Write an enzyme that holds these catalytic residues in place. Structure first.
Site, PDB file in Angstrom:
ATOM      1  N   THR A  48       0.709  -1.290  -0.127  1.00 22.97           N
ATOM      2  CA  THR A  48       0.032   0.085   0.031  1.00 22.97           C
ATOM      3  C   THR A  48       0.842   1.229   0.045  1.00 22.97           C
ATOM      4  O   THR A  48       0.446   2.298  -0.620  1.00 22.97           O
ATOM      5  CB  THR A  48      -0.844   0.017   1.253  1.00 22.97           C
ATOM      6  N   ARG A  56      -9.021  -5.422   1.193  1.00 21.38           N
ATOM      7  CA  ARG A  56     -10.039  -5.461   2.313  1.00 21.38           C
ATOM      8  C   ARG A  56      -9.919  -4.241   3.073  1.00 21.38           C
ATOM      9  O   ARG A  56     -10.790  -3.952   4.125  1.00 21.38           O
ATOM     10  CB  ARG A  56     -10.220  -6.677   2.933  1.00 21.38           C
ATOM     11  N   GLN A 104       0.902 -13.881  -0.331  1.00 23.26           N
ATOM     12  CA  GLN A 104      -0.472 -14.159  -1.332  1.00 23.26           C
ATOM     13  C   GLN A 104      -0.254 -12.794  -2.286  1.00 23.26           C
ATOM     14  O   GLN A 104      -1.008 -12.859  -3.080  1.00 23.26           O
ATOM     15  CB  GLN A 104      -1.403 -13.851  -0.512  1.00 23.26           C
ATOM     16  N   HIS A 124      -0.495 -17.255  -4.759  1.00 24.50           N
ATOM     17  CA  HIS A 124      -1.495 -16.626  -5.701  1.00 24.50           C
ATOM     18  C   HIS A 124      -1.071 -16.573  -7.151  1.00 24.50           C
ATOM     19  O   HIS A 124      -1.686 -15.857  -7.971  1.00 24.50           O
ATOM     20  CB  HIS A 124      -2.252 -15.347  -4.844  1.00 24.50           C
ATOM     21  N   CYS A 135       6.948 -27.749 -20.196  1.00 22.81           N
ATOM     22  CA  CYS A 135       8.145 -27.886 -19.429  1.00 22.81           C
ATOM     23  C   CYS A 135       8.135 -27.413 -18.193  1.00 22.81           C
ATOM     24  O   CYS A 135       9.186 -27.646 -17.325  1.00 22.81           O
ATOM     25  CB  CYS A 135       9.508 -27.778 -20.144  1.00 22.81           C
ATOM     26  N   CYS A 161      11.095 -26.507 -27.445  1.00 23.45           N
ATOM     27  CA  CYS A 161      10.181 -26.661 -26.621  1.00 23.45           C
ATOM     28  C   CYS A 161       8.763 -25.937 -27.353  1.00 23.45           C
ATOM     29  O   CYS A 161       7.843 -26.789 -27.556  1.00 23.45           O
ATOM     30  CB  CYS A 161       9.912 -26.351 -25.101  1.00 23.45           C
ATOM     31  N   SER A 200      -5.139  -9.928   6.246  1.00 16.17           N
ATOM     32  CA  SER A 200      -6.348 -10.079   6.999  1.00 16.17           C
ATOM     33  C   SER A 200      -6.438 -11.606   7.247  1.00 16.17           C
ATOM     34  O   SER A 200      -7.479 -11.982   8.050  1.00 16.17           O
ATOM     35  CB  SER A 200      -7.311  -9.223   6.369  1.00 16.17           C
ATOM     36  N   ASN A 224      -0.780  -5.869  11.464  1.00 17.17           N
ATOM     37  CA  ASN A 224      -1.782  -5.336  10.733  1.00 17.17           C
ATOM     38  C   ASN A 224      -2.576  -4.135  11.185  1.00 17.17           C
ATOM     39  O   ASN A 224      -2.938  -4.085  12.400  1.00 17.17           O
ATOM     40  CB  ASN A 224      -2.956  -6.299  10.353  1.00 17.17           C
ATOM     41  N   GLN A 226      -6.064  -3.474  10.419  1.00 15.13           N
ATOM     42  CA  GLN A 226      -7.262  -4.055  10.669  1.00 15.13           C
ATOM     43  C   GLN A 226      -7.380  -5.402  11.595  1.00 15.13           C
ATOM     44  O   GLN A 226      -6.123  -6.163  11.631  1.00 15.13           O
ATOM     45  CB  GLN A 226      -8.223  -4.403   9.456  1.00 15.13           C
TER      46      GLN A 226
HETATM   47  N1  LIG Z   1       0.770  -0.036   5.459  1.00 18.04           N
HETATM   48  C1  LIG Z   1       0.080  -1.005   6.132  1.00 18.04           C
HETATM   49  N2  LIG Z   1       0.624  -1.429   7.459  1.00 18.04           N
HETATM   50  C2  LIG Z   1      -0.220  -2.476   7.904  1.00 18.04           C
HETATM   51  N3  LIG Z   1      -1.345  -3.253   7.581  1.00 18.04           N
HETATM   52  C3  LIG Z   1      -1.669  -2.641   6.566  1.00 18.04           C
HETATM   53  C4  LIG Z   1      -1.288  -1.456   5.600  1.00 18.04           C
HETATM   54  N4  LIG Z   1      -1.834  -1.384   4.542  1.00 18.04           N
HETATM   55  C5  LIG Z   1      -3.023  -2.307   4.369  1.00 18.04           C
HETATM   56  N5  LIG Z   1      -2.798  -2.855   5.813  1.00 18.04           N
HETATM   57  C6  LIG Z   1      -3.721  -4.108   6.236  1.00 18.04           C
HETATM   58  O1  LIG Z   1      -3.181  -5.103   5.120  1.00 18.04           O
HETATM   59  C7  LIG Z   1      -4.415  -5.984   5.142  1.00 18.04           C
HETATM   60  C8  LIG Z   1      -4.572  -6.580   3.688  1.00 18.04           C
HETATM   61  O2  LIG Z   1      -5.389  -7.537   3.815  1.00 18.04           O
HETATM   62  P1  LIG Z   1      -6.353  -7.822   2.400  1.00 18.04           P
HETATM   63  O3  LIG Z   1      -6.675  -6.526   1.888  1.00 18.04           O
HETATM   64  O4  LIG Z   1      -7.522  -8.673   2.939  1.00 18.04           O
HETATM   65  O5  LIG Z   1      -5.136  -8.696   1.590  1.00 18.04           O
HETATM   66  P2  LIG Z   1      -4.728  -9.869   1.514  1.00 18.04           P
HETATM   67  O6  LIG Z   1      -3.161 -10.206   1.014  1.00 18.04           O
HETATM   68  O7  LIG Z   1      -4.817 -10.559   2.920  1.00 18.04           O
HETATM   69  O8  LIG Z   1      -5.596 -10.896   0.721  1.00 18.04           O
HETATM   70  C9  LIG Z   1      -5.693 -12.408   0.516  1.00 18.04           C
HETATM   71  C10 LIG Z   1      -5.921 -12.412  -1.048  1.00 18.04           C
HETATM   72  O9  LIG Z   1      -7.561 -12.244  -1.218  1.00 18.04           O
HETATM   73  C11 LIG Z   1      -7.435 -11.442  -2.327  1.00 18.04           C
HETATM   74  O10 LIG Z   1      -8.534 -11.636  -2.951  1.00 18.04           O
HETATM   75  C12 LIG Z   1      -6.242 -11.814  -3.252  1.00 18.04           C
HETATM   76  O11 LIG Z   1      -6.361 -12.904  -3.829  1.00 18.04           O
HETATM   77  C13 LIG Z   1      -5.244 -11.987  -2.163  1.00 18.04           C
HETATM   78  O12 LIG Z   1      -4.075 -12.394  -2.282  1.00 18.04           O
HETATM   79  C14 LIG Z   1      -5.602  -5.458   5.544  1.00 18.04           C
HETATM   80  O13 LIG Z   1      -6.418  -5.972   6.713  1.00 18.04           O
HETATM   81  C15 LIG Z   1      -5.096  -3.990   5.741  1.00 18.04           C
HETATM   82  O14 LIG Z   1      -5.751  -3.506   6.917  1.00 18.04           O
HETATM   83 ZN   LIG Z   2       8.798 -25.413 -22.254  1.00 17.33          ZN
END
Ligand SMILES: Nc1ncnc2c1ncn2[C@@H]1O[C@H](COP(=O)(O)OP(=O)(O)OC[C@H]2O[C@H](O)[C@H](O)[C@@H]2O)[C@@H](O)[C@H]1O
Ligand SMILES: [Zn+2]
Ligand SMILES: COc1nc(N)nc2nc[nH]c12
Ligand SMILES: [Cl-]
Ligand SMILES: [Cl-]
Length: 282
Positions: A48, A56, A104, A124, A135, A161, A200, A224, A226
């Protein structure tokens, strides 16, 4: 896909007050010092501060969708710089304080930060990575592979290939890559400390891997803004900007955060570099 469970979105942020935050980052330092095997778990929160919105958070992709608004990028994937947190994780692996890195994130920043791919699980996929169907040879490109959902990119394998090259970006229905998940699960099981940064923990099995550390007495730290699905199971919860936490942690560990020279791909980890001697704890 349209109906796919996108989880709890837009939960309120928590900010540990400075005195509580300073004390908890010292406790994290203590835990890193005491731990033989440290595994980090990263999600979109660590990118971010480089202009890439999370999923989220208050202004996340899914959060904004839910309110009929659009996510906002302050960068392209190609122009995005690894954060202080990204570069801290490079140095922690280089000095032998990080055993494995489970992410992720598809933003490609771990690979481009110079983090060794043989200590990284990209659960992911990676926007910059395409893979030969025949291959399995992977190619780390300097621009995003223009498709998502494991489709043909239009390019062909060049291994001495001509197989169909496909993006590595999992759609909702797609199984995680078996190689990355097995290595992530083994790392998390064997860990005596799992630290989660800006995730999250709402996606299975990715979000559950840090819990695996808890089996056989391992410690879990969640960093985190959140709440997260597994806050209950944490020995330590730090509610602050992951860059503030990691810069203070590195300072406590006597480590510098290295300069980023631009996008570089490292396949294999080296033996650990020298690191400061450990404090007397108990
Ligand atoms: N600077 C920061 N410092 C601390 N926490 C932070 C900051 N910025 C954001 N956050 C927190 O960072 C958290 C990020 O949570 P989410 O947004 O759920 O992302 P995931 O990586 O877990 O998503 C999982 C998969 O879902 C998707 O569909 C994709 O497929 C993803 O790969 C939040 O709670 C923010 O509060
Ligand atoms: Zn190949
Ligand atoms: C799937 O790639 C992405 N990663 C992140 N972090 N945010 C996005 N917004 C749209 N696509 C995005
Ligand atoms: Cl908007
Ligand atoms: Cl882009």
């Amino acid at each position: 896909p349209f109906t796919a469970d996108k989880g709890k979105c837009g939960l309120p942020e928590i900010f540990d007050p400075p005195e509580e935050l300073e004390r908890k980052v010292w406790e994290l330092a203590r835990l890193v010092w005491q731990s033989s095997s440290v595994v980090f778990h990263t999600g979109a929160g660590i990118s971010t501060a480089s202009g890439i919105p999370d999923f989220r958070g208050p202004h996340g992709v899914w959060t904004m969708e839910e309110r009929g608004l659009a996510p906002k990028f302050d960068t392209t994937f190609e122009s995005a710089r690894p954060t202080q947190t990204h570069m801290a994780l490079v140095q922690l692996e280089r000095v032998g304080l990080l055993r494995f890195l489970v992410s992720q994130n598809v933003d490609g920043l771990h690979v481009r930060s110079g983090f060794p791919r043989d200590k990284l699980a990209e659960l992911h996929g990676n926007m910059f990575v395409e893979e030969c169907a025949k291959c399995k040879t992977q190619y780390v490109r300097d621009t995003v592979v223009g498709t998502m959902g494991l489709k043909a990119t239009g390019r062909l394998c060049t291994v001495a290939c001509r197989g169909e090259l496909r993006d590595t970006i999992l759609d909702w229905e797609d199984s995680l890559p078996d190689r990355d998940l097995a290595l992530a699960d083994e790392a998390s099981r064997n860990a005596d400390l799992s630290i989660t940064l800006g995730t999250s923990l709402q996606i299975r099995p990715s979000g559950n891997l840090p819990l695996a550390t808890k089996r056989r007495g391992g410690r879990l730290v969640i960093v985190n803004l959140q709440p997260t699905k597994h806050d209950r199971h944490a020995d330590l919860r730090i509610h602050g900007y992951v860059d503030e936490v990691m810069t203070r942690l590195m300072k406590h560990l006597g480590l510098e955060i290295p300069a980023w020279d631009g996008p570089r791909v490292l396949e294999r980890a080296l033996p650990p570099l020298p690191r400061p001697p450990t404090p007397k704890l108990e």
